[PDB]
Amino acid sequence: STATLCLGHHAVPNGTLVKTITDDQIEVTNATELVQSSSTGKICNNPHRILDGIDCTLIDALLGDPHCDVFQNETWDLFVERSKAFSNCYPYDVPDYASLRS
Amino acid sequence: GLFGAIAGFIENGWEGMIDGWYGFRHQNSEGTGQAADLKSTQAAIDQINGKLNRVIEKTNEKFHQIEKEFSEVEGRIQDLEKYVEDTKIDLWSYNAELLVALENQHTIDLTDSEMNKLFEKTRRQLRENAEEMGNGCFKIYHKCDNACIESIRNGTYDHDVYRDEALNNRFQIKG
Amino acid sequence: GLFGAIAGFIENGWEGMIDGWYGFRHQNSEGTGQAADLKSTQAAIDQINGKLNRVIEKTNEKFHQIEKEFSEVEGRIQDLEKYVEDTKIDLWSYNAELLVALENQHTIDLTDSEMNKLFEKTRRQLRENAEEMGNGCFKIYHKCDNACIESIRNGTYDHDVYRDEALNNRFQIKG
Amino acid sequence: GLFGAIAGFIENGWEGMIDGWYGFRHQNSEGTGQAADLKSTQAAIDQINGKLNRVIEKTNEKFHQIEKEFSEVEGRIQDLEKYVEDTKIDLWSYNAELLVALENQHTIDLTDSEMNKLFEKTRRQLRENAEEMGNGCFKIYHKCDNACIESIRNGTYDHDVYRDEALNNRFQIKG
Amino acid sequence: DTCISECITPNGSIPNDKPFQNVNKITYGACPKYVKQNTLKLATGMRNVPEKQT
Numbered sequence: 301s302t303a304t305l306c307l308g309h310h311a312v313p314n315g316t317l318v319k320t321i322t323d324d325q326i327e328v329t330n331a332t333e334l335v336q337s338s339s340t341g342k343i344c345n346n347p348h349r350i351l352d353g354i355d356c357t358l359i360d361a362l363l364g365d366p367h368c369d370v371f372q373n374e375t376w377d378l379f380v381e382r383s384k385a386f387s388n389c390y391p392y393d394v395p396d397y398a399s400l401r402s
Numbered sequence: 403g404l405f406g407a408i409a410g411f412i413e414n415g416w417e418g419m420i421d422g423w424y425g426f427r428h429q430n431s432e433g434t435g436q437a438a439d440l441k442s443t444q445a446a447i448d449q450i451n452g453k454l455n456r457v458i459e460k461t462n463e464k465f466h467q468i469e470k471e472f473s474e475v476e477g478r479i480q481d482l483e484k485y486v487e488d489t490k491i492d493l494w495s496y497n498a499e500l501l502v503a504l505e506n507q508h509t510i511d512l513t514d515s516e517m518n519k520l521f522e523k524t525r526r527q528l529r530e531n532a533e534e535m536g537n538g539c540f541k542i543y544h545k546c547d548n549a550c551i552e553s554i555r556n557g558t559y560d561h562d563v564y565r566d567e568a569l570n571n572r573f574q575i576k577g
Numbered sequence: 578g579l580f581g582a583i584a585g586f587i588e589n590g591w592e593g594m595i596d597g598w599y600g601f602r603h604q605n606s607e608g609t610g611q612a613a614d615l616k617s618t619q620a621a622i623d624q625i626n627g628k629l630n631r632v633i634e635k636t637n638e639k640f641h642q643i644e645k646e647f648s649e650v651e652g653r654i655q656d657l658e659k660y661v662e663d664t665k666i667d668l669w670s671y672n673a674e675l676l677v678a679l680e681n682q683h684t685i686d687l688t689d690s691e692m693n694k695l696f697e698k699t700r701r702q703l704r705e706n707a708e709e710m711g712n713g714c715f716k717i718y719h720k721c722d723n724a725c726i727e728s729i730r731n732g733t734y735d736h737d738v739y740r741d742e743a744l745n746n747r748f749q750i751k752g
Numbered sequence: 753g754l755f756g757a758i759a760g761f762i763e764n765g766w767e768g769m770i771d772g773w774y775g776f777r778h779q780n781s782e783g784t785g786q787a788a789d790l791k792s793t794q795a796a797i798d799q800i801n802g803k804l805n806r807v808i809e810k811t812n813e814k815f816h817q818i819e820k821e822f823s824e825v826e827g828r829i830q831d832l833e834k835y836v837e838d839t840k841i842d843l844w845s846y847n848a849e850l851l852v853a854l855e856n857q858h859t860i861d862l863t864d865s866e867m868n869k870l871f872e873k874t875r876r877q878l879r880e881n882a883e884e885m886g887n888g889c890f891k892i893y894h895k896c897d898n899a900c901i902e903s904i905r906n907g908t909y910d911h912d913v914y915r916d917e918a919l920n921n922r923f924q925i926k927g
Numbered sequence: 928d929t930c931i932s933e934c935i936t937p938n939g940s941i942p943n944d945k946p947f948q949n950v951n952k953i954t955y956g957a958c959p960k961y962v963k964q965n966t967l968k969l970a971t972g973m974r975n976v977p978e979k980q981t
């Protein structure tokens with residue numbers, strides 16, 4: 301005889317669950333992530349100034365351990381201190397090392 | 403469904419409407435077909451991509467800070483250096499674990515909006531010219547077709563001129 | 578009453594409807610009776626107990642922390658150990674004194690929803706078959722009774738079949 | 753325009769309505785004039801100055817704290833005293849820079865509420881006595897005038913008594 | 928390594944586009960404020976109702 305008119309939204313089958321003020325579970329069309337899950341595992345040499353302490357520890361690089369000569373007059377933006385790191389020189393104690401470091 | 407509509411009384415899912423986020427379904431003489439909308443599809447997604455620009459990609463760049471992992475037992479200062487940072491995290495977390503709960507919940511009554519505001523639109527540009535068959539879909543009295551369709555589906559509809567079939571098939575027919 | 582309804586245009590309080598959180602009042606030939614609902618009563622309370630579970634009984638277990646009360650005047654660290662803990666309480670409070678404000682105000686436009694989405698439903702499953710007498714209550718043209726009631730009060734109502742009394746008592750009778 | 757109305761389907765700006773925040777526009781035989789409202793103009797502005805009293809003029813009075821500017825390099829404690837306070841500012845700010853986003857967005861769906869709850873009111877106290885001419889404005893069948901106006905503009909309107917012009921000029925006139 | 932990434936974590940270097948990261952409380956400059964939660968999904972679209980059987 302005549303015409304019928306239906307109206308609405310739309311949808312999908314691969315919906316993802318979410319949380320809101322009321323439901324700790326709901327299936328919306330599309331949602332995105334807001335929490336950096338994990339990382340690759342390498343430090344980008346840029347855009348910062350990175351300096352591998354290598355075996356030298358900043359303090360030792362400071363004082364001038366027999367073997368940190370390599371790090372003379374150095375500079376940076378982010379000094380990275382390593383684990384395999386050590387000091388090979390007249391044993392010493394820096395009171396409030398923390399700060400002399402920081 | 404705060405506004406009601408979606409997952410409320412239009413309890414059906416539009417399977418694969420891919421030409422957008424909204425639209426209608428005409429059952430005219432020429433058969434059928436689910437048409438795509440705009441000022442509503444764009445409208446909603448207009449906003450969603452607004453609240454989000456806010457959230458995503460923005461502030462915070464801090465350089466030299468306080469230490470946070472510790473090699474030997476120091477006491478006090480240590481204790482403190484912790485409880486300060488911990489407290490931060492804790493806070494920043496609750497702030498986040500809600501920015502969502504809100505932004506999210508309201509992301510919803512934001513879509514369940516454009517709906518209850520379109521059917522609530524057609525049901526305006528046309529008087530006794532037709533009524534949402536029960537609920538969900540509509541009911542027409544005129545012999546509207548693919549061409550005739552570009553009426554509502556364009557807000558180009560005279561409930562005045564194109565009115566002939568009024569009282570008729572309604573309450574007028576035998577009973 | 579953001580949605581309007583409650584304490585809006587249904588300005589009367591349902592005294593002692595104990596068989597639920599909602600319902601109707603029929604004035605058929607069989608006298609009267611305030612009937613109790615479900616998909617709205619369980620519906621709202623479904624949600625309230627939802628946002629709540631969220632709030633109530635959850636996180637936070639912290640063991641060794643910083644001290645917070647002090648026996649002698651220390652200065653600096655002291656000052657700080659305070660100011661840190663003070664700042665915490667202070668923040669945590671404002672988060673609290675608003676989690677309420679919000680969850681609370683929206684707890685409302687959530688009840689004043691189920692209302693303005695039921696009258697808005699009856700006023701769908703039945704065409705010219707009746708109209709909400711002025712406001713608040715409805716107006717019927719058929720001689721509906723206790724049995725006939727399980728129509729809308731079950732969504733089992735034909736505005737097509739059970740339509741007889743249409744135009745009539747409406748705009749049809751003398752004037 | 754969550755609720756839709758404002759900046760929604762009443763797409764016109766009421767230029768200089770100063771006798772209030774709302775009102776109508778009658779096109780009777782007596783010409784025209786834009787009347788001012790109340791239980792809606794006060795109503796909305798009733799709440800704006802409520803959510804506001806909340807924000808504005810309130811808490812926070814703190815005396816002796818931690819310093820925040822520093823003359824010489826001290827390390828550690830220094831670092832901390834900063835990062836403690838810095839963290840504060842940072843938080844309080846997000847707490848602020850949102851109190852707005854929310855309170856502000858919802859300040860809106862609160863104005864676009866009173867609207868869609870007045871037309872939706874006139875469209876209640878009067879049956880087939882008239883219909884919102886398409887959208888925005890209304891359509892009357894009766895010869896209402898400056899006096900007759902104090903009907904809706906007072907909730908003083910009988911869609912029963914003052915009904916005469918019903919079916920008529922509607923779907924009744926030739927077609 | 929050779930690349931760019933305004934954010935350094937003892938854990939590696941991460942992308943700053945998100946707002947929150949759960950990589951490591953220790954960061955360097957441009958970086959996602961650290962959160963306890965390992966994931967927080969945000970609705971980009973409207974709800975959703977199942978076709979058949981969900």
